[PDB]
Design a protein around this nucleic acid. Structure first.
Ligand SMILES: [Mg+2]
Ligand SMILES: [Mg+2]
Ligand SMILES: [Mg+2]
Ligand SMILES: [Mg+2]
Ligand SMILES: [Mg+2]
Ligand SMILES: [Mg+2]
Ligand SMILES: [Mg+2]
Ligand SMILES: [Mg+2]
Ligand SMILES: [Mg+2]
Ligand SMILES: [Mg+2]
Ligand SMILES: [Mg+2]
Ligand SMILES: [Mg+2]
Ligand SMILES: [Mg+2]
Ligand SMILES: [Mg+2]
Ligand SMILES: [Mg+2]
Ligand SMILES: [Mg+2]
Lengths: 48, 217, 117, 203
RNA sequence: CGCGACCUCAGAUCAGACGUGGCGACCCGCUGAAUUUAAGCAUAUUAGUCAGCGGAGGAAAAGAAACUAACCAGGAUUCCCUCAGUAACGGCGAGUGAACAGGGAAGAGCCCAGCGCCGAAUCCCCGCCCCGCGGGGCGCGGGACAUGUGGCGUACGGAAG
RNA sequence: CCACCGGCCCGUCUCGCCCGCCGCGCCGGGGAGGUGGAGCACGAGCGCACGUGUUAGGACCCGAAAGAUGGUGAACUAUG
RNA sequence: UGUAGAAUAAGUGGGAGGCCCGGGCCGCCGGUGAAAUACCACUACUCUGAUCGUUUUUUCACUGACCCGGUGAGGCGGGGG
């Protein structure tokens, strides 16, 4: 989760979701995990 | 990294690049430039782009067209007053090498009859094929009205071997709707060639003749 | 009671050996605004409840006299725990090397002082 | 009220607060013996949802097992068979390690009855389970008639007939299209009814 | 330094109670070949069986869907006839081999963790009476379990107020 | 009943034009030939029993050198 | 930095005008070659330069997991004499 937040913070959602597909089971759970990490990262570093 | 080909973001970028520095107004009638930067191509083997894009609104100048041949075709050339030159003065163009490029730079688009394409790369050899301006072969008794009408608007999409291509799509004294319609007729050749999507364009630049560059939103 | 905001004062014992039984309570009382105090000796909470281990004591309701004493306690407890929570949450406790090794590194530091000055 | 927070704090077990406790407990349980009697459970809610009601007679054992799929016991790699069976190094031994721990705890203390078990720790080689044991002849369990089923004598040694939670999951029984392999009772009962060639008086 | 409280623990010919060993025809959990077949033989087959080990009762196991289906839908488990020598597996060879629909036999559903409400309203042990036999069960005082969670109300068909 | 021709259904192939319209379409239906089929072309099965033959079963009877599983032996002999 | 061109031509494409205060400079023309600049945009390698970082490799180092020895676990490390 911590290194996926860095990769989805800077680089690319494609590489991020490919890493999540490697680490958890399949593509659907990877989609929800991606959206949850995107919401958490957006709330954290857009809450100023 | 985000890129659309959407109409209002095309037209808004046209309005921004026109309104840049107030009106960057100088004594020449400004032309509109389009740069396409492309991604994920290998034209080293089999990926060169070369076609004829006929811009529907207006191609700045009514193009300087020179036709070489002889028949009723050349009588219609003298009827339209297309600058047409005969066999004897072609063999006069044989005699000097710079005399080839004196008629090549002053006249933009080259059309030539079917009968003379055997002779033309002997006289006009070093100029046209190496510079890119080799003439187009024609029908022996063709109606030149529709040919000149299409050649007035037909530019060439030649991405060569390099990764990037700029073309002029008209002038600023046109309406901006005609300008954005020329930009759509430019990008339609990209979406017609490429198989997957328009994602080979991460960024394409809209410019004036010398105005500031605008990334397409 | 802390969820439904009835608790005036939450007493948390120190010595709970599965600490998972407790470790939600400080941040939870921090969110819900109820002041909490960590007191040492979980057997010492048992002698007031007639039992061995007690782990937690809730204060919700007070008598007439004890209100001023309870508020006097709550003021110092809010000074200690709740208002310093953002301070406490970033401290990493421990990381203390063995005293023989600390003495050896300090002796080598005196050797470094002998090399320099 | 608070066991929900207990369960959720134990739920995301890879975070930094819990894995310190897990590492300390793995070292703690590795330095002790193989089987002994913890006085009280280390996962109170998870032991409680398996049936631990903290009263007189519910014992908690902590038990330790070694990891790894089993090695075939033939000497010097000599199977004496076809090339199907020469594979000494790679067999996995169907039963789960949780049911192995339940077997060892029960047959070390055969006087008790095994209710269930759960995970508490692992580091490299040793894997750690805690097993709840119900006393059969204490009066607190021989009364209270919701509980008398384990005192009923058909439940001697549930762990070796595989009636526990890990036992059912090892035997592989459910319903539906993913379980035609054992149609009724067990795979041997299914095999019995399918290959028993049935013959009536009239044919 | 002493004392006290727990927490981890040991000891005892401590008070009381329990497990071991057998028979194994049927059942349950694991382990597990090879003859043979294929005209040879390596996968296959013999078979997840003989042998081995551990368990259990008069039955055991299974069981109230993380189901079957795809249309006018059925409805825990078990057993029989059909499905069917079929779909399928297989040096696609020898051979292997189901299941839901259908009709019968039997008919049965339930509880707890969680959640919250009830002042621990709960249980065990000891001691005195209580009572009537063939023989043991309710009530009253003091020692414990237990607040790291007894009991009542409560289960996904909704439940509580 | 035999022999042949003609007919019909299904799969494919070839050549062709017409019709239908719960919706006008890379939609259906159709025609004429030559072919593959365990077909139709007024149905003959099903159940029982007996006989013969073939196959799987210890299978007409007896027969091996082998292989696997699990155990019992160092009282003769071998060597500490 | 093959050759020619005043000029190390990476490339495309617009292109007769651009820059600035009646005017000058650059470009056009001449001329090169096969391809020519002004003004303008992108696409590249060849190196330099800084860190929210990033990772693994390497270098040493500490000990608390783990391992190795010895004891009837007998004086260990600091600080005082
Ligand atoms: Mg106890
Ligand atoms: Mg059961
Ligand atoms: Mg028959
Ligand atoms: Mg033979
Ligand atoms: Mg042989
Ligand atoms: Mg098999
Ligand atoms: Mg046997
Ligand atoms: Mg026995
Ligand atoms: Mg019996
Ligand atoms: Mg249910
Ligand atoms: Mg049949
Ligand atoms: Mg089989
Ligand atoms: Mg053999
Ligand atoms: Mg042998
Ligand atoms: Mg043997
Ligand atoms: Mg002897």
């Amino acid at each position: 989760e911590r290194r996926a937040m860095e990769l989805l913070k800077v680089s690319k959602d494609k590489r991020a979701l490919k890493f999540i597909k490697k680490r958890v089971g399949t593509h659907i759970r990877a989609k929800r995990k991606r959206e949850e990490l995107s919401n958490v990262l957006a709330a954290m570093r857009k809450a100023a | 990294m985000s890129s659309k080909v959407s109409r209002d973001t095309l037209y808004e970028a046209v309005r921004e690049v026109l309104h840049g520095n107030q009106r960057k107004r100088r004594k020449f009638l400004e032309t509109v430039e389009l740069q396409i930067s492309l991604k994920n191509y290998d034209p080293q083997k089999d990926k060169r782009f070369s076609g004829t894009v006929r811009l529907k609104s207006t191609p700045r100048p009514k193009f300087s067209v020179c036709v070489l041949g002889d028949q009723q075709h050349c009588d219609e050339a003298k009827a339209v007053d297309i600058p047409h030159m005969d066999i004897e003065a072609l063999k006069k163009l044989n005699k000097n090498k710079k005399l080839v490029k004196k008629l090549a730079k002053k006249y933009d688009a080259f059309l030539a009859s079917e009968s003379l394409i055997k002779q033309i790369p002997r006289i006009l050899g070093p100029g046209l094929n190496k510079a890119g301006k080799f003439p187009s072969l024609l029908t022996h008794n063709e109606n030149m009205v529709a040919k000149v009408d299409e050649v007035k608007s037909t530019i060439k999409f030649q991405m060569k071997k390099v990764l990037c291509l700029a073309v002029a799509v008209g002038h600023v004294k046109m309406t901006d709707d005609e300008l954005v319609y020329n930009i759509h007729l430019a990008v339609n050749f990209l979406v017609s060639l490429l198989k997957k999507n328009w994602q080979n364009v991460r960024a394409l630049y809209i410019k004036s003749t010398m105005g500031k560059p605008q990334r397409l939103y | 009671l802390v969820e439904n905001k009835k608790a005036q004062l939450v007493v948390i014992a120190h010595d709970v050996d599965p600490i998972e039984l407790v470790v939600f309570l400080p941040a939870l009382c921090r969110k819900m605004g109820v002041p909490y105090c960590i007191i040492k000796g979980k057997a010492r909470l048992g002698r007031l409840v007639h039992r061995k281990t007690c782990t937690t004591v809730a204060f919700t309701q007070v008598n007439s006299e004890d209100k001023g004493a309870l508020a006097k306690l709550v003021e110092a407890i809010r000074t200690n725990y709740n208002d310093r929570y953002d301070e406490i949450r970033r401290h990493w406790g421990g990381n203390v090397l063995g005293p023989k090794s600390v003495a050896r590194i300090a002796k080598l530091e005196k050797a470094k002082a002998k090399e320099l000055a | 009220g608070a066991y929900k927070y207990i369960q959720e704090l134990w739920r995301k077990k890879q975070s930094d607060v819990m894995r310190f406790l897990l590492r300390v407990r793995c070292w703690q349980y590795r330095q002790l013996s193989a089987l002994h009697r913890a006085p009280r459970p280390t996962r109170p809610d998870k032991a409680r949802r398996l049936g631990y009601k903290a009263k007189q007679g519910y014992v908690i054992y902590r038990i330790r097992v070694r990891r790894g799929g089993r090695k075939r016991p033939v000497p010097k790699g000599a199977t004496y068979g076809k090339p199907v069976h020469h594979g000494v190094n790679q067999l996995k031994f169907a039963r789960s390690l949780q049911s192995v721990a339940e077997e060892r705890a029960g047959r070390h203390c055969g006087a008790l009855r095994v209710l269930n078990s759960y995970w508490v720790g692992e580091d490299s080689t040793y894997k750690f389970f805690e097993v709840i044991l119900i006393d059969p002849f204490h009066k607190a369990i021989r009364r209270n008639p919701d509980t008398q089923w384990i005192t009923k004598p058909v439940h001697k040694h549930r762990e070796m007939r595989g009636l526990t939670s890990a036992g059912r999951k090892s035997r592989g029984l459910g319903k539906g299209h993913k379980f035609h392999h054992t149609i009724g009772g067990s795979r041997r009962a299914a095999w019995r009814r399918r290959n028993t060639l049935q013959l009536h008086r009239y044919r």
